Design an enzyme around this catalytic site. Structure first.
Site, PDB file in Angstrom:
ATOM      1  N   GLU A   1       6.357   4.403   5.179  1.00  0.00           N
ATOM      2  CA  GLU A   1       6.507   5.562   6.054  1.00  0.00           C
ATOM      3  C   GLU A   1       7.887   6.240   6.130  1.00  0.00           C
ATOM      4  OE1 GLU A   1       6.088   2.276   7.115  1.00  0.00           O
ATOM      5  OE2 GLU A   1       7.292   1.946   9.010  1.00  0.00           O
TER       6      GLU A   1
ATOM      7  N   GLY B   1       0.801  -1.226   0.000  1.00  0.00           N
ATOM      8  CA  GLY B   1       0.000   0.000   0.000  1.00  0.00           C
ATOM      9  C   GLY B   1       0.845   1.292   0.000  1.00  0.00           C
TER      10      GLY B   1
ATOM     11  N   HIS C   1      -2.327   5.823   8.147  1.00  0.00           N
ATOM     12  CA  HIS C   1      -1.367   4.826   8.592  1.00  0.00           C
ATOM     13  C   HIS C   1       0.075   5.292   8.497  1.00  0.00           C
ATOM     14  CE1 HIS C   1      -0.187   0.469   9.086  1.00  0.00           C
ATOM     15  NE2 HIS C   1       0.863   0.914   8.436  1.00  0.00           N
ATOM     16  N   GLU C   2       0.506   5.719   7.293  1.00  0.00           N
ATOM     17  CA  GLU C   2       1.900   6.156   7.155  1.00  0.00           C
ATOM     18  C   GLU C   2       2.199   7.328   8.063  1.00  0.00           C
ATOM     19  OE1 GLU C   2       3.271   3.629   5.871  1.00  0.00           O
ATOM     20  OE2 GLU C   2       1.545   3.013   4.736  1.00  0.00           O
TER      21      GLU C   2
ATOM     22  N   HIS D   1       2.798   6.295  11.662  1.00  0.00           N
ATOM     23  CA  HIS D   1       4.100   5.680  11.865  1.00  0.00           C
ATOM     24  C   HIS D   1       5.147   6.745  12.244  1.00  0.00           C
ATOM     25  CE1 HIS D   1       4.055   1.454  10.888  1.00  0.00           C
ATOM     26  NE2 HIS D   1       3.675   1.613   9.632  1.00  0.00           N
TER      27      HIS D   1
ATOM     28  N   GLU E   1       3.576  -2.148  13.555  1.00  0.00           N
ATOM     29  CA  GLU E   1       2.427  -2.358  12.598  1.00  0.00           C
ATOM     30  C   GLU E   1       1.117  -2.567  13.303  1.00  0.00           C
ATOM     31  OE1 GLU E   1       2.721  -1.365   9.703  1.00  0.00           O
ATOM     32  OE2 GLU E   1       4.865  -1.464   9.372  1.00  0.00           O
TER      33      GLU E   1
HETATM   34  C1  LIG Z   1       7.010  -2.479   4.485  1.00  0.00           C
HETATM   35  C2  LIG Z   1       5.736  -1.663   4.149  1.00  0.00           C
HETATM   36  C3  LIG Z   1       5.938  -1.406   2.644  1.00  0.00           C
HETATM   37  C4  LIG Z   1       4.514  -2.390   4.506  1.00  0.00           C
HETATM   38  C5  LIG Z   1       3.174  -1.630   4.462  1.00  0.00           C
HETATM   39  N1  LIG Z   1       2.295  -2.677   4.426  1.00  0.00           N
HETATM   40  C6  LIG Z   1       1.252  -2.480   3.509  1.00  0.00           C
HETATM   41  O1  LIG Z   1       1.215  -1.520   2.740  1.00  0.00           O
HETATM   42  N2  LIG Z   1       0.188  -3.385   3.437  1.00  0.00           N
HETATM   43  C7  LIG Z   1      -0.971  -3.175   2.427  1.00  0.00           C
HETATM   44  C8  LIG Z   1      -1.050  -4.058   1.248  1.00  0.00           C
HETATM   45  C9  LIG Z   1      -1.494  -3.370   0.116  1.00  0.00           C
HETATM   46  C10 LIG Z   1      -1.572  -3.982  -1.134  1.00  0.00           C
HETATM   47  C11 LIG Z   1      -1.236  -5.318  -1.175  1.00  0.00           C
HETATM   48  F1  LIG Z   1      -1.376  -5.977  -2.306  1.00  0.00           F
HETATM   49  C12 LIG Z   1      -0.804  -6.068  -0.099  1.00  0.00           C
HETATM   50  C13 LIG Z   1      -0.671  -5.450   1.138  1.00  0.00           C
HETATM   51  F2  LIG Z   1      -0.185  -6.299   2.121  1.00  0.00           F
HETATM   52  C14 LIG Z   1       3.075  -0.815   5.719  1.00  0.00           C
HETATM   53  O2  LIG Z   1       2.917  -1.271   6.831  1.00  0.00           O
HETATM   54  N3  LIG Z   1       3.285   0.504   5.547  1.00  0.00           N
HETATM   55  O3  LIG Z   1       3.340   1.319   6.681  1.00  0.00           O
HETATM   56 ZN   LIG Z   2       2.810   0.175   8.378  1.00  0.00          ZN
END
Ligand SMILES: CC(C)C[C@@H](NC(=O)NCc1ccc(F)cc1F)C(=O)NO
Ligand SMILES: [Zn+2]
Ligand SMILES: [Mg+2]
Ligand SMILES: [Mg+2]
Ligand SMILES: [Mg+2]
Length: 890
Positions: free
Chosen positions: A268, A265, A301-302, A305, A324
């Protein structure tokens, strides 16, 4: 493989204090020169100095300006750079390297990569080592001075973390910009971006200290018109952290950047949050409603963080849930506040109890603080995130708002500018708990079991009422099934938020109260209970558990109509559906296995159907809530309650139940679909990208849910409504017209019409792909092949690949075709995708997680494809670990 254990944590023998980088971008190479100002720690025992560095081409290595030579002073194996101990200084020293990397061929989207015409980084968890050498672990905190250079025409905007301190021209049409990030950070929070980006900006003034912060949101030029709602959501996020948590932003500038090619998604990075474009960009003419919610949550969310992850970071990756789980809890509090709709909290519960409960009953089951890993990337799970969030939320339930806020501030201040562990959080919450109990001997030692114990607890109830004494008891038992992580499961500290409803008049009988269950079983007794109540249990879904209410369907119907709590009302409905689903499933299964020529089905409870009608016809009841009551539980929820599941029998079960209800309610459904139109599709705010009416969005959701029900039913002349709906200015409506047209000859005309409406916006085209993919078509396999050949083609964009395949995998009848052709198709995609993006390939494995829940023919077919994938040469460590764990080999 190579296994890291939580217990073996040790601090490093080295310290990295400052990082000075020059990143010089050219067409066919990027040169990264890096100076690390290092020192020896108090833990040093004269060991070799070992850096992580993956896929780097070395130009030069030195220490204190002494060149080091391969085979003589160092070795490099494409993963680790080892400087032999004789050449490692004994006090402060400068380590210099220059390496060459290739963003233009980095299709794994980790490290430094090209996304369309933007160069961008992604360093969490292990990506910084693909940019330059480092001791790439989150306890190695340092300050960063970053210079980026590039061709000015191609890459006019250059960003890195923190303050831009200089910008300069370079001969040959290049330019540079230098950044200083004054906050100590781990390397996973480093970021750089270079591109032809456009922006919107605003100034935000902090609430307490009145610091002026410049807010920038960036995209490629084509989509600059789609940035406004993100900017608004950023302002909302900042105000929320000020208002609830007393937390202000800590730099002069915050940049958010959308890129087309992103694995998840968003991320941060300090002062430079980078997003999947699907989680930052929207416009009301070109986005479905769900985009607005998604952007709000991901920006939030971001942003959150910035304290929970950035200003307080992780000691090690086993602590992932500390940032998280806690950030998802903050994001959820924020979302509930901003939307003011009960469906927000229900949506989080639905996600947990479907996907995360499946995970927790699977061979992949882990506690929210894992004990081991091979690839840390495989632990970014719905367990760590969503169960983590519920564990973080239970502290608020236990403490109340005032003492929760006290504990959170103990934590955030004590650990500021440093690393932390789950224990540090539990210790802070324990200080608040002592204060709340006014007892400095109270402790939360038992609470730690929520971090270390895997599996979902089962909580069951028995009730007794003594009419003479006006005294009511709730006897409660908890059980967690033993598993591979613990052979003996201990009782948890389970908070049970409870009300009591008078069944005569539907009114509340007690102040809401929170029962603190700490033993395996306990009996809670209430006096001055004037009539026998119906209990309203786990209000707000107060713990992440399986609830066995032991209520009759008559009692469940009374709570559905009359209780105050939206979750208990929804869960009472859920439970009536589950009882019916399991009963009909068993009826159908026995008929099939016994080859019966005739048999009976239990009808859906007529009083429940009357209750549904009563709620739908109430003009003052919530539209979002109504859409949850006319939908059966999700398949992934249902499957947690069935062993050896025959998916065809389940499909026939759901169709029978839906048909029973529609046979009674379709005319109500039609009347409401028409009556809601005027308010649902009112164009107030249609040009305002700073404001969303979430209640109105839930009205559209309800219309679209009803339209699906009526379309599947072949309600008379409903095709006329479908065609009218395709003319709506709301994409949510016109794309719903495509899915619901699946049941009619007009499907391919709507396919073409909506394709034409979608094809010129990258994100809208992805939403059209998902709409096609999830369409209830007998010819879905031929439609997927048409998408592959005509639209997807050779795309390596994770959003395109996910859009084409994942929705189809939720087609219970077609994906689980008894031939195995569904399993084969997705396994081929996984293996193909693993050759260039292992993280995405593991995402695509999701349908296989329930393999050992299926009937034995489908278990065998899935297993055969999993073992085929495992045999693939050069399989990634990510995919191999995932599949070995999933198939009980690791
Ligand atoms: C290491 C970072 C890149 C992890 C990020 N996690 C995250 O964006 N999960 C949402 C998500 C979105 C699309 C997708 F296909 C799969 C996911 F797990 C997160 O916790 N951002 O704060
Ligand atoms: Zn996160
Ligand atoms: Mg390389
Ligand atoms: Mg979320
Ligand atoms: Mg594209």
């Amino acid at each position: 493989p190579k296994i890291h254990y939580r217990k073996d944590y040790k601090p490093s023998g080295f310290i990295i204090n400052n990082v000075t980088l020059n990143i010089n971008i050219h067409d066919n190479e990027t040169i990264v020169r890096s100076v690390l100002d290092m020192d020896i720690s108090k833990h040093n025992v004269g060991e070799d100095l070992v850096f992580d560095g993956v896929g780097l081409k070395i130009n030069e290595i030195s220490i204190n300006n002494k060149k080091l030579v391969e085979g003589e002073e160092y070795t490099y194996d494409n993963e680790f750079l080892t400087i032999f101990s004789k050449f490692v200084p004994k006090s402060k020293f400068a380590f210099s390297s220059e390496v060459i990397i290739h963003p233009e061929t980095n299709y794994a989207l980790t490290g430094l990569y090209k996304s369309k015409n933007i160069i961008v980084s992604q360093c969490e968890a292990t990506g910084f080592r693909r940019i330059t050498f480092f001791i790439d672990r989150p306890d190695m905190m340092a300050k960063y001075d970053v210079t980026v250079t590039a061709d000015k025409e191609k890459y006019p905007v250059l960003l890195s973390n923190g303050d831009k301190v200089n910008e300069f021209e370079i001969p040959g049409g290049r330019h540079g910009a230098r950044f200083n990030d004054p906050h100590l950070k781990p390397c996973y929070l480093f970021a750089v971006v270079a591109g032809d980006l456009k922006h919107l900006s605003a100034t935000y003034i902090t609430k307490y200290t009145k610091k002026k912060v410049e807010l920038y949101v960036f995209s490629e030029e084509k989509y600059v018109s789609k940035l406004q709602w993100a900017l608004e959501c950023l302002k909302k996020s900042m105000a929320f952290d000020e208002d609830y948590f007393g937390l202000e932003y800590d730099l002069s500038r915050l940049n958010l950047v959308a890129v087309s090619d992103f694995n998840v998604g968003a991320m941060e990075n300090k002062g430079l949050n980078i997003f999947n474009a699907n989680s930052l960009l929207a416009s009301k003419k070109n986005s479905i409603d769900f985009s607005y919610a998604r952007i709000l949550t991901v920006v939030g969310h971001e942003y959150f963080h910035n304290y929970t992850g950035n200003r307080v970071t992780l000691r090690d990756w086993f602590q992932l849930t500390l940032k998280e789980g806690l950030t998802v809890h903050r994001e959820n509090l924020f979302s509930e506040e901003m939307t003011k709709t009960v469906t927000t909290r229900l949506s989080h519960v639905d996600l947990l109890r479907s996907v995360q409960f499946l995970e927790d009953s699977s061979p992949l089951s882990h506690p929210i603080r894992p004990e081991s890993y091979v690839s840390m990337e495989n632990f970014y799970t719905t367990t760590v995130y969503d169960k983590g969030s519920e564990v973080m939320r239970m502290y608020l339930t236990i403490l109340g708002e005032e003492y929760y806020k006290k504990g959170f501030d103990i934590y955030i201040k004590k650990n500021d500018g440093n690393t932390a562990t789950c224990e540090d959080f539990n210790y802070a919450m324990e200080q608040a708990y002592k204060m709340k109990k006014a007892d400095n001997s109270a402790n939360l030692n038992q609470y730690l079991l929520w971090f270390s114990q895997s599996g979902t607890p089962h909580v069951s109830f028995k009730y007794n009422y003594d009419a003479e004494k006006k005294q009511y008891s709730i006897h409660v038992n908890q059980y967690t099934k033993p598993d591979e992580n613990q052979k003996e499961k201990k009782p948890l500290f389970i908070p049970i938020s409870v009300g009591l409803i008078n069944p005569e008049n539907g009114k509340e009988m007690i102040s809401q109260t929170t029962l603190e269950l700490t033993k395996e079983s306990d009996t809670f007794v209430f006096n001055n209970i004037a009539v026998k109540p119906i209990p309203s249990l786990f209000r707000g879904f107060s713990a992440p558990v399986y609830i066995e209410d032991n209520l009759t369907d008559e009692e469940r119907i009374l709570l559905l109509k009359y209780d105050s709590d939206a979750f208990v009302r929804y869960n009472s409905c859920t439970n009536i559906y589950m009882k019916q689903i399991l009963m009909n499933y068993n009826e159908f299964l026995k008929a099939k296995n016994e080859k019966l020529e005739s048999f009976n089905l239990t009808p859906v409870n007529a009083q429940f159907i009357d209750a549904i009608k009563y709620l739908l016809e109430d003009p003052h009841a919530d539209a979002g809530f109504k859409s949850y009551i006319v939908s059966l539980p999700q398949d992934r929820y249902i499957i947690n309650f069935v062993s050896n599941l025959d998916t065809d029998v389940l499909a026939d079960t759901k169709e029978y139940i839906y048909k029973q209800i529609g046979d009674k309610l379709n005319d109500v459904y039609y009347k409401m679909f028409k009556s809601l139109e005027a308010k649902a599709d009112d164009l107030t705010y249609f040009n305002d990208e700073s404001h969303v009416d979430f209640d109105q969005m839930n009205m559209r959701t309800l219309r679209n849910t009803l339209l699906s029900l009526l379309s599947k039913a072949q309600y008379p002349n409903i095709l006329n409504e479908i065609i009218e709906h395709s003319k709506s200015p709301y994409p949510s409506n016109w794309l719903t017209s495509l899915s619901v047209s699946a049941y009619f000859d007009k499907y391919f005309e709507l396919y073409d019409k909506t394709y034409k409406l979608s094809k010129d916006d990258e994100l809208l085209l992805q939403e059209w792909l998902k709409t096609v993919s999830r369409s209830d078509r007998k010819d879905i396999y031929e439609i997927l092949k048409k998408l592959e050949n005509e639209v997807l083609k050779d795309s390596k964009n994770p959003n395109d690949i996910r859009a084409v395949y994942l929705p189809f995998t939720n087609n219970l009848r077609r994906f689980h075709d008894i031939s195995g052709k569904g399993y084969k198709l997705i396994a081929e995609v996984i293996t193909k995708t693993d050759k260039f993006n292992p993280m995405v390939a593991t995402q695509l494995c999701e349908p296989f997680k329930l393999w050992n829940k299926l009937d034995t023919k489908r278990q065998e077919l899935m297993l055969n494809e999993m073992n085929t994938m495992l045999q693939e040469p050069n399989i990634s460590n990510n995919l191999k670990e995932y599949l070995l764990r999933l198939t009980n080999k690791l």
